[PDB]
Ligand binder design. Sequence first.
Ligand SMILES: [Zn+2]
Length: 30
Amino acid sequence: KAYACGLCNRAFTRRDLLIRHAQKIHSGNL
Ligand SMILES: [Zn+2]
């Protein structure tokens, strides 16, 4: 769905923001 981190609930306009977020906040998707 719309670029929205179901983890922090955060949502961005771009995906990169969503990605870098996972690699920033949840730094780790493994
Ligand atoms: Zn998140």
